[PDB]
Amino acid sequence: MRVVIQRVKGAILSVRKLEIISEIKNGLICFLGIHKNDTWEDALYIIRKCLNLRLWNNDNKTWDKNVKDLNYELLIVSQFTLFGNTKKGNKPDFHLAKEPNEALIFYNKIIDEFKKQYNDDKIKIGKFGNYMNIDVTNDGPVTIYIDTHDIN
């Protein structure tokens, strides 16, 4: 599983009819790529790190507060392009990306877990598989990358 996490002052997600369907203020936008061979342990890890990474400064301290500490939100967005392989040519290929039907179930299960580990009202999502327009106010910016197939 891969995730690109970006610290934001807000984000506004839109889909084509453009129309708004999701919005957050301060918090994280998480581009989430699900792998062909991802287990639930892979998803737990991502969820844990999104909720607990200390990406905000506080008072005298830096990298001190996490998204929950500040009661901030998460916009969780499915992003298979993160498995776009560009090693062998300029046309990205996504053979590693878990197939769209199983991926959607996995993603939904992941969104449930996010809400369970945090707060139902604090977890926003995008339209899985659909073209989306997302206006993001990057705060910093702060971009973090995690590939669960780097730990075991």
Ligand X SMILES: O=S([O-])[O-]
Which residues of this protein are in contact with ligand X, per CB under 6 A?
Answer: 16, 22-23, 124, 130-131
The bridge status of strand 27-33 relative to strand 73-78 is parallel
Among this protein's residues, is 86 annotated catalytic? no
80 assigned to a ligand binding site: yes
The CA distances from residue 75 to 8, 27, 36, 85, 151, in Å, are: 10, 8, 23, 25, 25
Q: Please tell me whether residue 107 binds a second copy under the rule CB under 8 A.
A: no
Structure tokens at 84: 């776009």
* Nearest distance in Å: CB 28, ligand X: 15
Helix (H) or strand (E) holding 75: strand 73-78
* Nearest distance in Å: CB 16, ligand X: 4
Is the link from the previous residue into 141 a cis peptide, with omega within 30 of 0? yes
117/137 with CB nearer a second copy: 137
Q: Site residues (CB under 8 A) for a second copy? A: 2, 4, 9, 31, 49, 52-55, 63-64, 66, 77, 79, 81-82, 84, 86-87, 90-92, 131-146, 150-151
